Design a protein that fits this description.
Layout: H1 3-7, E1 22-23, E2 34-37, E3 39-40, E4 43-44, H2 49-54, E5 59-63, E6 73-76, E7 79-84, H3 87-98, E8 107-112, H4 117-130, E9 135-139, E10 142-145, H5 154-166, E11 171-175, H6 178-182, E12 193-196, H7 207-223, E13 228-232, H8 236-244, E14 249-252, E15 264-274, E16 277-284, E17 289-293, H9 298-313, H10 318-324, E18 336-338, E19 345-349, H11 354-366, E20 372-376, H12 386-397, E21 400-403, H13 413-422, E22 431-432, H14 436-446, E23 452-456, E24 463-466, E25 469-472, H15 475-483
Parallel strand pairs: 1-2, 2-5, 5-7, 8-11, 8-12, 9-11, 12-13, 13-14, 14-15, 19-23, 20-21, 20-23, 21-22
Antiparallel strand pairs: 3-4, 6-7, 9-10, 15-16, 16-17, 18-19, 24-25
Main location: cytoplasm
GO molecular function: ATP binding; magnesium ion binding; UDP-N-acetylmuramoylalanyl-D-glutamate-2,6-diaminopimelate ligase activity
Pfam family, one: Mur_ligase
Length: 487
């Protein structure tokens, strides 16, 4: 890594200097580093140039605004200070070059939208790895090779992607946030494909507002290297964009493919939501098929179809994708199904808010031939407002509500339960059982073979906080043991 080579596309005359790491933070800026001095929200990195120099940085690239002309090379205490205009906009490119263009050395797929990013990225990484990639994810759960995802500027993004390339990754599925996009955090990444799940963007009822939002997003899209575009046609905004993008792939499970456009498409023609997943029949411009998914609910059918369409668009053979679909797993503790011969289906989900609980129950209901049970509680020593709302939801969307404890902390457990029951029309119809393990057991043991039990609020978490004690407890393990299976 050399300053002169780093800057060659933009500044021809730049001095030769060996460089170690690239950093925006003067505090960690060490001997031989490149310090990048940016102007951001209420902070100006240029003010920390002396500190960085004093700490022995090899070189500095700095925002030119109000200080210098674009490409101006200065020297301070023998340290080159090179000024660039619109440095925030160019930081991704600068870091990309610094880290040897990681997105040109693996197949990077970006997933954007309000919901389903995490699941879709996981599915992309898993499925590609099933077909022989070494896959990785970058998202809200963390970054890493599949199964080793460890829990954020344009520099950090490039650095992390380079780390993955160094570890052998040949495929990366990345969550891209609206905020990340707008702040130029992925500006220079070469996406092989870009996936759009959905837009629950409230506050856009005014046509001028929807117009400006769309305009701003279109402008950003046009500036990025998005590669193959894969768009959920079951989303309203999705459809409007598809009408403008004849090379985009349209994905639907609700009959929104327009076959007159002769574009690429994939659509679920029928779905059987059953006691251990979903049987998905689909047609596509690549051929037709049937997938056995072990994911639960309609949203996860959508997520799966988006991943499928993406991998098809990138040239992964349909026959191979079909052969590996049954190996795709849920995100741990997210609508995670547990089944055993002749027992109720049990779903463990992290849902711990009214909206999440409603969604989880509606999803579970699809797979439920019999009665739907909901085992849940609310956290103690936290905002109490959600409690009656979760009670009303459980009463409405489940057939049996089993109210129990969920991290009661130092609050009287029964008081929490009372707040929950208060939200019900008929609290007397709810079951209450304290000891969470006992409540889960009660549902699982009483539920009929064709019933579904949703165990909500913990997901992957393996603790129950009672008092100041973090007790070893897992819904997944409890359910697994009851069903005679392995979590």
């Amino acid at each position: 890594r050399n300053l002169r080579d780093l800057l060659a596309p933009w500044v021809p005359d730049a001095p030769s200097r060996a460089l170690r790491e690239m950093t925006l933070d003067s505090r960690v800026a060490a001997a031989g580093d490149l310090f990048v001095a940016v102007v951001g929200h209420q902070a100006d990195g240029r003010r920390y140039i002396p500190q960085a120099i004093a700490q022995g940085v090899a070189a500095i690239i700095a925002e030119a605004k109000d200080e210098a002309t674009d490409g101006e090379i200065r020297e301070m205490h023998g340290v080159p200070v090179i000024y660039l205009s619109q440095l925030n906009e160019r930081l991704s490119a600068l870091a990309g070059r610094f880290y040897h263009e990681p997105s040109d050395n693996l197949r990077l797929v970006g997933v954007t939208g309000t919901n389903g990013k995490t699941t879709t990225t996981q599915l992309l990484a898993q499925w590609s790895q099933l077909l022989g990639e070494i896959s990785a994810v970058m998202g809200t759960v963390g970054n890493g090779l599949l199964g080793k995802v460890i829990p954020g500027s344009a520099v950090d993004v490039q650095h992390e992607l380079a780390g993955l390339v160094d570890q052998g990754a040949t495929f990366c599925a990345m969550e891209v946030s609206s905020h990340g996009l707008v702040q130029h955090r992925v500006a220079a990444l070469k996406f092989a494909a870009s996936v759009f799940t959905n837009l629950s963007r409230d506050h856009l009822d005014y046509h001028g507002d929807m117009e400006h939002y769309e305009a701003a997003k279109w402008l950003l899209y046009s500036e990025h290297h998005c590669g193959q575009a894969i768009i959920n046609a079951d989303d309203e905004v999705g459809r409007r964009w598809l009408a403008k993008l004849p090379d985009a792939v349209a994905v639907s499970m609700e009959d929104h493919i327009n076959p007159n456009c002769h574009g690429r498409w994939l659509k679920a023609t029928e779905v059987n939501y059953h006691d251990s997943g979903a049987t998905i029949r689909f047609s596509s411009s690549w051929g037709d098929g049937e997938i056995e998914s072990h994911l639960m609910g309609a949203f996860n059918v959508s997520n799966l179809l988006l991943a499928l369409a993406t991998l098809l668009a990138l040239g992964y053979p349909l026959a191979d994708l079909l052969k590996t679909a049954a190996r795709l797993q849920p995100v741990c503790g997210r609508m995670e199904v547990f089944t055993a011969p002749g027992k109720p289906t049990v779903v463990v989900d992290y849902a711990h808010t009214p909206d999440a609980l409603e969604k989880a129950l509606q999803a579970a209901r699809l797979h439920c031939a019999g009665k739907l049970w909901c085992v849940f509680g609310c956290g103690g020593d936290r905002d109490k407002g959600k409690r009656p709302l979760m009670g009303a939801i459980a009463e409405e969307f489940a057939d049996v509500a089993v109210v129990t404890d969920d991290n009661p902390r130092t609050e009287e457990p029964r008081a929490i339960i009372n707040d929950i029951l208060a939200g019900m029309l008929d609290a007397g119809h709810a079951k209450v059982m304290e000891g969470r393990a006992e409540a889960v057991t009660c549902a699982v043991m009483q539920a009929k073979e064709n019933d579904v039990v949703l165990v909500a609020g913990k997901g992957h978490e393996d603790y129950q906080i009672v008092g100041n004690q973090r007790l070893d407890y897992s819904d997944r393990v409890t359910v697994a043991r009851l069903l005679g299976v392995i979590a």
